[PDB]
């Protein structure tokens, strides 16, 4: 078994700059049996480099294949707007394995999220479930701490987060946290708050509401 | 070509990840297919492209019983030897072509594939034999070469050598010392129904 | 299975091993020489030890093939170089002692160019006397009692190797035995050098007569109507190069230097070497290998790493050829580039030969090939051909003499010194000079041969010979006499093939295939065929000659005879500066 | 040269799925076909390799006892049947033209997976086809934001638009989230001028083709 | 079946030129085509081959310098030559290739065009008549380079015609003579014109030779 | 490669004689051998292919034989037209086909005396300032012939230049041209001009002359 380790696996670079992606094997892989792949969000993967260096047919000048032994690299001389995607290395020295991938992200300025709280609708409460939504709107970077405080009790194993792909204009992220709770469990509490900590914020920001107000 | 066509595996042979060494030359048999020679024509890779018995401009035109593709790695100065009636170290003791040889020999510089910083010593060429090889003979014996009068049964020492020596391929080698991958396409003319033919519009 | 057939099956096995292992050490050597670190020496020495240990392993195995059982002359030449435990014949204790003496002498020579700067630039008699005397008084007394046991043990080594003396051991680097009409005994080296030296005398005496005449205009109170030893332009009086500062024929006429024109067109290193490359293509020699243009170090690599920087050509093996020369935008470096590429062309030629035969024909062949490239690239025709000298600029009858005399002070001034030094060392080894006359006869020879007298009377506690590098470090010195003669022998024969018009000093070998073909016929062989046969493949003659050397300085020799019609020609061996 | 795949297929655990991959534009018999699967929001995972010539095959260890691959030269179509399905098998499955292993001799080649299919989404869950319970996320208290919760649907996907494609400025639709029920839930939000919060009517157009469920809902500001 | 060469002339060293071979009489598309050069010292040297399947072949001393082109449509063969050396000065022939079994041969050949690689400048010839069984001729004096073609009465007279090989003069230019032997019964009762043509300078001269 | 060698290098036979030309290959080349014919100012013509098979349009007079290393071209009965250089070419190693050096086949015939003619320089040439005087020897055998110039009576050499034709294809004789080049000043210092011819077909040296009028 050979394992290809791609670090950092999520690379933040400004457009037009050099991108140096890394693929490290557990065991020496012959240069003639290692390849690179591009995958833009929601699309199929395409072959960039094969035999460590050799470009595929419909590949621009930007992409340069390098590396030998265990430490291989994929070089993008200039990051064009279409280049910000996910990249996988692959070996067939022994069997066939892929790497973990590396998302090349657009590096934006620090942007704080606009936080919005949403009470469960009365229609949903008729259906005997309650889902309170905490919304983070347009922020960078991606990492954010979202905590659910119900009354004062910190919520753990009932929350679920979902985050969009990077914006196609301002290059920001938006995150949605949804706290699902049964009707019976919902009406046992008064205060429903979501606290958000992010690099861009001057202080943790709390949005809250009283149950039936 | 139609998608349903049965082309010959020239891509597998020529584009194999690793070649065997000349001493243990690898033989792949090609039969019952359509031979597309367009892949070979005009290639920007090949440094040596020679044919014996047939003109390469008429490869599409000919049918054969079988096609044998031999593959191995040599150094630049020794590419000369893979030909009919040639003599040398690898020609005498590793791989010999007949004098009435009907086929083609293709070679390309594989500097950046088979060389290595520190040296790649994975390609073994035979240096000694008691007898020259017959055409299309393969010697893989590990018997100690007795050059002296005194026997040295199963032991290396003075006047006694290990027959197989390792090529040293460094990235900074000279042209003649750089590794070259070689494919020898041998065409068979046996008195039996031919199987490998060129494009349908040719033959 | 014959001893001949066994010797073959051994040598080709050796050829396989020696190809890779030398190359591995060659890379390790290159690493340090381009990038001085304390891990590169550890990698260089560890590879040099593995190379050295392999040689003394194979030589021992090679001994079991007797030379008298070998008819094949080329296999005989191969083993001859391999099977040699020459110095490792003496007893363990004496062998270790000889090593320690050679260690001591070499170290105390270095430990003990400040004085050289004084002996090159100063015009003070006393300061040059101080620098000359104290050097021979310091180490010259230290080396004396150790040079005796050096002579004792080196003869012991030579006589145990069936050589008559240790001088005969060095004379064995010109020996050829077993080729009909090309054979050369060790004794013929003496007679040939003496015969050629006789023809040098007329030219050298007039050079001595002119240099004397110019030095008495500089030192009017420290001259003889022999010359002082500390007023010859260097430490020993080897090169009269630094005397051109005074002994200039015409201080009116300009010194030809196209360093200005090189920085006018901003000639970078990559162009300089390409301009050298095309020179060799112009004679039918191939252009440098692909690995040459990749791996060569032709400039100063900043200050992130420092290198040896001393211009050196490189034969790493396995078809690897490189130049190590942190080049500057100078004419000196322009010519040195041609010189060092000349070395490579030689290396590239005989690369097809078996490993052990890859070398110069003799010890003075390789360097003679390099210098003829510098001579042809310094010619006004070539300097206008490539475009460093203006097409309208022409030579005169005075700029010609200035150049030739500058060349003469370096070339002609060395031969009488080299012969004197080696004739001394030869007679010392065979014991024709007693130990209590080692210093007296040295100065007797200096007087009679070179025309040089000691400024201060020397005791037998001194050793003035061992003031020079080659003497103390134990190196043969006759190779400096031979290569000089070879140069012009190569030049003359090529210029006849290039159909050159006029004197030999104006010769440019460019744009002549017959010249390149004539040279390549020799270069391809190297240490594969007798040096007599090699020399013949160029000149057509089997022996050394000085008439090609005379032809180079013919217009100068006539000028010297003209200006020394009313001068003191010759020297009497009686006068001393303290008398 | 192009590779075309079956289309999204949804099956229960324990059942069998068979994805088809049609090849055109190249001699089918020369090149081999290999299969790669990708779990949602995860990396590529090699499954196996099939020779179009002799039918020799190499699978990974994780799939060795389940997966079976076949080819048909007459149709130039390669198949991939994975039996004994599990919940973790929920992935998008790709067929690709192979230049890593030769079809004739089964030896490694200098290349990779050059041509790729479009992929087939294969969902494996205990869940059955169910329409999304759409609930409004009312704007509470400059650029006030209102949303639309699309809770409990199976299988994916759902298409959501604001004002039937009239409002595209400042809209964010979050990817679905797999729930322990096996079903999926989604959120869609939009930033809106507070001056236009009372004037305009904002409708959330949820379309779920798998269940044939179209639901549009008002978002009442309160 | 015919092959006709074109293009050959004076080129400066390190320069470039193209050669053209016009084919006729056969289905050009179905036959392989070759260029072959002929030198005084080394004889016949093969320089390029082009196949029926668009394949090209070269010697190492050629590849990357010369490129062979083919027009199936126009029954034409081309050879684009770059980086010309002095050692490229040769007579270039275009020749067909065919096989009777496995055995290959060059059945039909061209007419030969002379490529001459020199730094020296081009110059047209100065033609002069030779005043008169009697004989008369034309002197083609001082020209560079080769070749020069002379014909008599636009090729109506061939019988007693001798065209001498050109001789390189001391000046560095060429000189040529062409003569014809004719019955004295035909002098004055038949006029004779030599058709001198020097392509490398486009100097076509037709001059009349008559009794003085 | 495969080097080709031909013997003999030069050959002279009479009309009707059987000529035997040999070709040697570097190595064993079965029957992959082709025989060619090249006349003075023409292109090679293919005579024999496959070492023995006769090309059409070639007189059955021609013959080919040999296999392996040694090959033989035979002209059954030499004819005057057959004056040519004959080349052998190997068809084994492709596409690097190689030729032999060629064998010159000269023709022996009866002695023939040269028809001597002298020509003055044209009035058009005296405009250039140079005078070229031509002496023609027409249809003679054998090739050996010595020519000398005379100005008034003074013998001049070093200013003349000789040119000789190849052997004729019909009568198989030679023709020679001699060109005396003078200055306009040197042409006006002399009156009568003559060229002297000596040949083994003439019993005496023959002269032809003209005056400057
Ligand atoms: C061994 O593999 C080779 C590499 O192939 C590719 O990658 C593999 C991993 C695999 O996925 C293959 O399917 C894939 O093709 C094989 O070579 C390919 O063979 C093709 C013919 O079958 C050949 O095609 C012709 O394409 C021409 C355009 O080619 C493209 O490549 C260009 C790279 O190269 C250059 O060289 C030329 C001069 O020779 C020069 O003009 C260019 O400037 C350039 O430097 C690239 O620049 C283009 O963008 C384009 O992508 C076309 O002109 C012609 O009409 C043909 O249709 C391919 O050229 C060739 N690919 C390469 C790069 O090698 C090879 O056949 C395999 N061996 C066998 C025996 O099968
Ligand atoms: C110089 O030597 C060191 C040895 O440790 C090596 O690692 C380094 O690569 C060298 N430096 C350069 C610039 O090549
Ligand atoms: C010596 O033997 C070698 C083979 O090892 C051979 O090349 C050579 O011809 C022989 N020497 C000579 C010159 O006879
Ligand atoms: C050597 O120089 C010649 C002429 O400039 C050039 O054609 C050639 O490419 C060079 N050598 C090689 C084989 O690279
Ligand atoms: C040789 O002659 C050429 C012109 O033919 C000239 O350009 C060149 O300078 C000469 N060679 C050299 C490098 O001296
Ligand atoms: Cl693509
Ligand atoms: Cl290395
Ligand atoms: Cl050997
Ligand atoms: Cl070897
Ligand atoms: Cl992953
Ligand atoms: Cl056109
Ligand atoms: Cl025909
Ligand atoms: Cl003439
Ligand atoms: Na070729
Ligand atoms: Na081994
Ligand atoms: Na056209
Ligand atoms: Na035919
Ligand atoms: Zn040197």
PDB file of N, CA and C in Angstrom, chain D residues 68-136:
ATOM      1  N   UNK D  68     -18.153  -5.818  -9.642  1.00  0.00           N
ATOM      2  CA  UNK D  68     -17.883  -6.573 -10.855  1.00  0.00           C
ATOM      3  C   UNK D  68     -17.995  -5.637 -12.057  1.00  0.00           C
ATOM      4  N   UNK D  69     -16.993  -5.701 -12.942  1.00  0.00           N
ATOM      5  CA  UNK D  69     -16.941  -4.854 -14.123  1.00  0.00           C
ATOM      6  C   UNK D  69     -16.992  -5.725 -15.376  1.00  0.00           C
ATOM      7  N   UNK D  70     -17.676  -5.215 -16.406  1.00  0.00           N
ATOM      8  CA  UNK D  70     -17.806  -5.891 -17.687  1.00  0.00           C
ATOM      9  C   UNK D  70     -17.668  -4.870 -18.814  1.00  0.00           C
ATOM     10  N   UNK D  71     -17.339  -5.364 -20.015  1.00  0.00           N
ATOM     11  CA  UNK D  71     -17.298  -4.552 -21.221  1.00  0.00           C
ATOM     12  C   UNK D  71     -17.998  -5.291 -22.357  1.00  0.00           C
ATOM     13  N   UNK D  72     -18.482  -4.517 -23.335  1.00  0.00           N
ATOM     14  CA  UNK D  72     -19.071  -5.052 -24.551  1.00  0.00           C
ATOM     15  C   UNK D  72     -18.514  -4.273 -25.740  1.00  0.00           C
ATOM     16  N   UNK D  73     -17.782  -4.982 -26.607  1.00  0.00           N
ATOM     17  CA  UNK D  73     -17.042  -4.381 -27.707  1.00  0.00           C
ATOM     18  C   UNK D  73     -17.996  -3.930 -28.811  1.00  0.00           C
ATOM     19  N   UNK D  74     -19.107  -4.661 -28.966  1.00  0.00           N
ATOM     20  CA  UNK D  74     -20.079  -4.412 -30.020  1.00  0.00           C
ATOM     21  C   UNK D  74     -20.813  -3.095 -29.780  1.00  0.00           C
ATOM     22  N   UNK D  75     -20.961  -2.725 -28.502  1.00  0.00           N
ATOM     23  CA  UNK D  75     -21.684  -1.523 -28.113  1.00  0.00           C
ATOM     24  C   UNK D  75     -20.704  -0.440 -27.665  1.00  0.00           C
ATOM     25  N   UNK D  76     -19.436  -0.834 -27.475  1.00  0.00           N
ATOM     26  CA  UNK D  76     -18.379   0.013 -26.939  1.00  0.00           C
ATOM     27  C   UNK D  76     -18.815   0.604 -25.599  1.00  0.00           C
ATOM     28  N   UNK D  77     -19.362  -0.259 -24.733  1.00  0.00           N
ATOM     29  CA  UNK D  77     -19.929   0.172 -23.466  1.00  0.00           C
ATOM     30  C   UNK D  77     -19.367  -0.682 -22.331  1.00  0.00           C
ATOM     31  N   UNK D  78     -18.816  -0.002 -21.319  1.00  0.00           N
ATOM     32  CA  UNK D  78     -18.306  -0.641 -20.118  1.00  0.00           C
ATOM     33  C   UNK D  78     -19.263  -0.466 -18.942  1.00  0.00           C
ATOM     34  N   UNK D  79     -19.425  -1.537 -18.157  1.00  0.00           N
ATOM     35  CA  UNK D  79     -20.353  -1.548 -17.037  1.00  0.00           C
ATOM     36  C   UNK D  79     -19.586  -1.649 -15.720  1.00  0.00           C
ATOM     37  N   UNK D  80     -20.265  -1.254 -14.636  1.00  0.00           N
ATOM     38  CA  UNK D  80     -19.754  -1.366 -13.282  1.00  0.00           C
ATOM     39  C   UNK D  80     -20.919  -1.711 -12.358  1.00  0.00           C
ATOM     40  N   UNK D  81     -20.945  -2.964 -11.889  1.00  0.00           N
ATOM     41  CA  UNK D  81     -21.997  -3.434 -11.004  1.00  0.00           C
ATOM     42  C   UNK D  81     -21.430  -3.631  -9.600  1.00  0.00           C
ATOM     43  N   UNK D  82     -22.000  -2.893  -8.640  1.00  0.00           N
ATOM     44  CA  UNK D  82     -21.623  -2.984  -7.240  1.00  0.00           C
ATOM     45  C   UNK D  82     -22.797  -3.561  -6.452  1.00  0.00           C
ATOM     46  N   UNK D  83     -22.596  -4.768  -5.913  1.00  0.00           N
ATOM     47  CA  UNK D  83     -23.626  -5.478  -5.173  1.00  0.00           C
ATOM     48  C   UNK D  83     -23.391  -5.306  -3.675  1.00  0.00           C
ATOM     49  N   UNK D  84     -24.404  -5.679  -2.881  1.00  0.00           N
ATOM     50  CA  UNK D  84     -24.372  -5.618  -1.426  1.00  0.00           C
ATOM     51  C   UNK D  84     -24.061  -4.190  -0.980  1.00  0.00           C
ATOM     52  N   UNK D  85     -24.877  -3.243  -1.459  1.00  0.00           N
ATOM     53  CA  UNK D  85     -24.652  -1.819  -1.260  1.00  0.00           C
ATOM     54  C   UNK D  85     -24.796  -1.457   0.216  1.00  0.00           C
ATOM     55  N   UNK D  86     -24.095  -0.388   0.612  1.00  0.00           N
ATOM     56  CA  UNK D  86     -24.076   0.100   1.981  1.00  0.00           C
ATOM     57  C   UNK D  86     -24.258   1.616   1.961  1.00  0.00           C
ATOM     58  N   UNK D  87     -24.524   2.194   3.138  1.00  0.00           N
ATOM     59  CA  UNK D  87     -24.852   3.605   3.274  1.00  0.00           C
ATOM     60  C   UNK D  87     -23.667   4.489   2.889  1.00  0.00           C
ATOM     61  N   UNK D  88     -22.448   3.956   3.036  1.00  0.00           N
ATOM     62  CA  UNK D  88     -21.232   4.715   2.786  1.00  0.00           C
ATOM     63  C   UNK D  88     -20.869   4.673   1.301  1.00  0.00           C
ATOM     64  N   UNK D  89     -21.631   3.899   0.517  1.00  0.00           N
ATOM     65  CA  UNK D  89     -21.382   3.755  -0.909  1.00  0.00           C
ATOM     66  C   UNK D  89     -21.967   4.941  -1.673  1.00  0.00           C
ATOM     67  N   UNK D  90     -22.722   5.792  -0.966  1.00  0.00           N
ATOM     68  CA  UNK D  90     -23.334   6.973  -1.555  1.00  0.00           C
ATOM     69  C   UNK D  90     -22.237   7.916  -2.046  1.00  0.00           C
ATOM     70  N   UNK D  91     -22.051   7.940  -3.372  1.00  0.00           N
ATOM     71  CA  UNK D  91     -20.991   8.696  -4.020  1.00  0.00           C
ATOM     72  C   UNK D  91     -21.367   8.967  -5.475  1.00  0.00           C
ATOM     73  N   UNK D  92     -20.572   9.816  -6.138  1.00  0.00           N
ATOM     74  CA  UNK D  92     -20.662  10.012  -7.576  1.00  0.00           C
ATOM     75  C   UNK D  92     -19.597   9.144  -8.246  1.00  0.00           C
ATOM     76  N   UNK D  93     -20.035   8.311  -9.195  1.00  0.00           N
ATOM     77  CA  UNK D  93     -19.190   7.286  -9.784  1.00  0.00           C
ATOM     78  C   UNK D  93     -18.774   7.701 -11.193  1.00  0.00           C
ATOM     79  N   UNK D  94     -17.457   7.704 -11.433  1.00  0.00           N
ATOM     80  CA  UNK D  94     -16.881   8.139 -12.695  1.00  0.00           C
ATOM     81  C   UNK D  94     -16.260   6.950 -13.422  1.00  0.00           C
ATOM     82  N   UNK D  95     -16.498   6.881 -14.737  1.00  0.00           N
ATOM     83  CA  UNK D  95     -15.732   6.018 -15.622  1.00  0.00           C
ATOM     84  C   UNK D  95     -14.732   6.878 -16.389  1.00  0.00           C
ATOM     85  N   UNK D  96     -13.537   6.326 -16.615  1.00  0.00           N
ATOM     86  CA  UNK D  96     -12.467   7.068 -17.258  1.00  0.00           C
ATOM     87  C   UNK D  96     -11.688   6.154 -18.198  1.00  0.00           C
ATOM     88  N   UNK D  97     -11.172   6.742 -19.284  1.00  0.00           N
ATOM     89  CA  UNK D  97     -10.284   6.036 -20.192  1.00  0.00           C
ATOM     90  C   UNK D  97      -8.913   5.911 -19.531  1.00  0.00           C
ATOM     91  N   UNK D  98      -8.367   4.692 -19.560  1.00  0.00           N
ATOM     92  CA  UNK D  98      -7.207   4.336 -18.763  1.00  0.00           C
ATOM     93  C   UNK D  98      -5.960   4.288 -19.640  1.00  0.00           C
ATOM     94  N   UNK D  99      -4.921   5.005 -19.198  1.00  0.00           N
ATOM     95  CA  UNK D  99      -3.580   4.855 -19.736  1.00  0.00           C
ATOM     96  C   UNK D  99      -2.601   4.714 -18.572  1.00  0.00           C
ATOM     97  N   UNK D 100      -2.903   3.760 -17.682  1.00  0.00           N
ATOM     98  CA  UNK D 100      -2.039   3.404 -16.567  1.00  0.00           C
ATOM     99  C   UNK D 100      -1.709   1.914 -16.634  1.00  0.00           C
ATOM    100  N   UNK D 101      -2.640   1.127 -17.186  1.00  0.00           N
ATOM    101  CA  UNK D 101      -2.450  -0.302 -17.365  1.00  0.00           C
ATOM    102  C   UNK D 101      -2.938  -0.701 -18.756  1.00  0.00           C
ATOM    103  N   UNK D 102      -2.102  -1.469 -19.467  1.00  0.00           N
ATOM    104  CA  UNK D 102      -2.385  -1.894 -20.828  1.00  0.00           C
ATOM    105  C   UNK D 102      -3.457  -2.979 -20.883  1.00  0.00           C
ATOM    106  N   UNK D 103      -4.248  -2.963 -21.962  1.00  0.00           N
ATOM    107  CA  UNK D 103      -5.384  -3.858 -22.117  1.00  0.00           C
ATOM    108  C   UNK D 103      -4.921  -5.259 -22.511  1.00  0.00           C
ATOM    109  N   UNK D 104      -3.860  -5.327 -23.326  1.00  0.00           N
ATOM    110  CA  UNK D 104      -3.407  -6.574 -23.922  1.00  0.00           C
ATOM    111  C   UNK D 104      -2.542  -7.365 -22.943  1.00  0.00           C
ATOM    112  N   UNK D 105      -1.586  -6.679 -22.302  1.00  0.00           N
ATOM    113  CA  UNK D 105      -0.552  -7.354 -21.534  1.00  0.00           C
ATOM    114  C   UNK D 105      -0.704  -7.071 -20.041  1.00  0.00           C
ATOM    115  N   UNK D 106      -1.512  -6.057 -19.706  1.00  0.00           N
ATOM    116  CA  UNK D 106      -1.816  -5.722 -18.324  1.00  0.00           C
ATOM    117  C   UNK D 106      -0.592  -5.210 -17.572  1.00  0.00           C
ATOM    118  N   UNK D 107       0.223  -4.404 -18.261  1.00  0.00           N
ATOM    119  CA  UNK D 107       1.427  -3.827 -17.682  1.00  0.00           C
ATOM    120  C   UNK D 107       1.282  -2.309 -17.624  1.00  0.00           C
ATOM    121  N   UNK D 108       1.990  -1.694 -16.670  1.00  0.00           N
ATOM    122  CA  UNK D 108       1.834  -0.284 -16.351  1.00  0.00           C
ATOM    123  C   UNK D 108       2.341   0.592 -17.495  1.00  0.00           C
ATOM    124  N   UNK D 109       1.631   1.701 -17.734  1.00  0.00           N
ATOM    125  CA  UNK D 109       1.908   2.604 -18.842  1.00  0.00           C
ATOM    126  C   UNK D 109       2.201   4.004 -18.309  1.00  0.00           C
ATOM    127  N   UNK D 110       2.943   4.787 -19.102  1.00  0.00           N
ATOM    128  CA  UNK D 110       3.238   6.173 -18.777  1.00  0.00           C
ATOM    129  C   UNK D 110       2.028   7.023 -19.159  1.00  0.00           C
ATOM    130  N   UNK D 111       1.220   7.384 -18.154  1.00  0.00           N
ATOM    131  CA  UNK D 111       0.042   8.207 -18.372  1.00  0.00           C
ATOM    132  C   UNK D 111      -0.836   8.315 -17.128  1.00  0.00           C
ATOM    133  N   UNK D 112      -2.155   8.265 -17.348  1.00  0.00           N
ATOM    134  CA  UNK D 112      -3.143   8.358 -16.286  1.00  0.00           C
ATOM    135  C   UNK D 112      -4.554   8.097 -16.809  1.00  0.00           C
ATOM    136  N   UNK D 113      -5.547   8.700 -16.144  1.00  0.00           N
ATOM    137  CA  UNK D 113      -6.920   8.680 -16.623  1.00  0.00           C
ATOM    138  C   UNK D 113      -7.161   9.949 -17.439  1.00  0.00           C
ATOM    139  N   UNK D 114      -7.089   9.816 -18.770  1.00  0.00           N
ATOM    140  CA  UNK D 114      -7.031  10.966 -19.658  1.00  0.00           C
ATOM    141  C   UNK D 114      -8.428  11.533 -19.899  1.00  0.00           C
ATOM    142  N   UNK D 115      -9.361  10.665 -20.308  1.00  0.00           N
ATOM    143  CA  UNK D 115     -10.731  11.067 -20.578  1.00  0.00           C
ATOM    144  C   UNK D 115     -11.632  10.587 -19.444  1.00  0.00           C
ATOM    145  N   UNK D 116     -12.541  11.469 -19.010  1.00  0.00           N
ATOM    146  CA  UNK D 116     -13.427  11.199 -17.891  1.00  0.00           C
ATOM    147  C   UNK D 116     -14.883  11.297 -18.338  1.00  0.00           C
ATOM    148  N   UNK D 117     -15.752  10.535 -17.663  1.00  0.00           N
ATOM    149  CA  UNK D 117     -17.192  10.633 -17.850  1.00  0.00           C
ATOM    150  C   UNK D 117     -17.767  11.848 -17.127  1.00  0.00           C
ATOM    151  N   UNK D 118     -19.100  11.964 -17.132  1.00  0.00           N
ATOM    152  CA  UNK D 118     -19.771  13.082 -16.483  1.00  0.00           C
ATOM    153  C   UNK D 118     -20.099  12.718 -15.036  1.00  0.00           C
ATOM    154  N   UNK D 119     -20.097  11.412 -14.742  1.00  0.00           N
ATOM    155  CA  UNK D 119     -20.379  10.908 -13.408  1.00  0.00           C
ATOM    156  C   UNK D 119     -21.852  10.552 -13.234  1.00  0.00           C
ATOM    157  N   UNK D 120     -22.111   9.524 -12.416  1.00  0.00           N
ATOM    158  CA  UNK D 120     -23.463   9.137 -12.046  1.00  0.00           C
ATOM    159  C   UNK D 120     -23.588   9.138 -10.525  1.00  0.00           C
ATOM    160  N   UNK D 121     -24.523   9.948 -10.014  1.00  0.00           N
ATOM    161  CA  UNK D 121     -24.814   9.997  -8.591  1.00  0.00           C
ATOM    162  C   UNK D 121     -25.586   8.740  -8.198  1.00  0.00           C
ATOM    163  N   UNK D 122     -25.047   8.003  -7.220  1.00  0.00           N
ATOM    164  CA  UNK D 122     -25.675   6.789  -6.726  1.00  0.00           C
ATOM    165  C   UNK D 122     -25.901   6.940  -5.223  1.00  0.00           C
ATOM    166  N   UNK D 123     -27.177   7.050  -4.833  1.00  0.00           N
ATOM    167  CA  UNK D 123     -27.556   7.270  -3.446  1.00  0.00           C
ATOM    168  C   UNK D 123     -28.063   5.963  -2.841  1.00  0.00           C
ATOM    169  N   UNK D 124     -27.467   5.582  -1.705  1.00  0.00           N
ATOM    170  CA  UNK D 124     -27.849   4.379  -0.982  1.00  0.00           C
ATOM    171  C   UNK D 124     -28.238   4.772   0.442  1.00  0.00           C
ATOM    172  N   UNK D 125     -29.533   4.623   0.752  1.00  0.00           N
ATOM    173  CA  UNK D 125     -30.075   4.936   2.065  1.00  0.00           C
ATOM    174  C   UNK D 125     -31.331   4.107   2.324  1.00  0.00           C
ATOM    175  N   UNK D 126     -31.700   3.992   3.607  1.00  0.00           N
ATOM    176  CA  UNK D 126     -32.917   3.313   4.023  1.00  0.00           C
ATOM    177  C   UNK D 126     -34.139   4.150   3.649  1.00  0.00           C
ATOM    178  N   UNK D 127     -33.896   5.430   3.345  1.00  0.00           N
ATOM    179  CA  UNK D 127     -34.934   6.407   3.058  1.00  0.00           C
ATOM    180  C   UNK D 127     -35.627   6.086   1.735  1.00  0.00           C
ATOM    181  N   UNK D 128     -36.870   6.563   1.608  1.00  0.00           N
ATOM    182  CA  UNK D 128     -37.644   6.462   0.381  1.00  0.00           C
ATOM    183  C   UNK D 128     -37.961   7.862  -0.140  1.00  0.00           C
ATOM    184  N   UNK D 129     -38.446   7.930  -1.387  1.00  0.00           N
ATOM    185  CA  UNK D 129     -38.725   9.187  -2.064  1.00  0.00           C
ATOM    186  C   UNK D 129     -39.731  10.002  -1.250  1.00  0.00           C
ATOM    187  N   UNK D 130     -39.350  11.244  -0.933  1.00  0.00           N
ATOM    188  CA  UNK D 130     -40.135  12.113  -0.069  1.00  0.00           C
ATOM    189  C   UNK D 130     -39.895  13.569  -0.462  1.00  0.00           C
ATOM    190  N   UNK D 131     -40.978  14.356  -0.455  1.00  0.00           N
ATOM    191  CA  UNK D 131     -40.944  15.752  -0.860  1.00  0.00           C
ATOM    192  C   UNK D 131     -40.519  16.671   0.282  1.00  0.00           C
ATOM    193  N   UNK D 132     -39.897  17.834  -0.022  1.00  0.00           N
ATOM    194  CA  UNK D 132     -39.379  18.730   1.012  1.00  0.00           C
ATOM    195  C   UNK D 132     -40.455  19.565   1.703  1.00  0.00           C
ATOM    196  N   UNK D 133     -40.432  19.545   3.040  1.00  0.00           N
ATOM    197  CA  UNK D 133     -41.268  20.419   3.846  1.00  0.00           C
ATOM    198  C   UNK D 133     -40.638  21.809   3.878  1.00  0.00           C
ATOM    199  N   UNK D 134     -41.211  22.722   3.088  1.00  0.00           N
ATOM    200  CA  UNK D 134     -40.659  24.054   2.899  1.00  0.00           C
ATOM    201  C   UNK D 134     -41.235  24.982   3.966  1.00  0.00           C
ATOM    202  N   UNK D 135     -40.346  25.696   4.667  1.00  0.00           N
ATOM    203  CA  UNK D 135     -40.736  26.596   5.740  1.00  0.00           C
ATOM    204  C   UNK D 135     -40.062  27.954   5.551  1.00  0.00           C
ATOM    205  N   UNK D 136     -40.790  29.074   5.765  1.00  0.00           N
ATOM    206  CA  UNK D 136     -40.215  30.408   5.585  1.00  0.00           C
ATOM    207  C   UNK D 136     -39.341  30.820   6.766  1.00  0.00           C
TER     208      UNK D 136
END
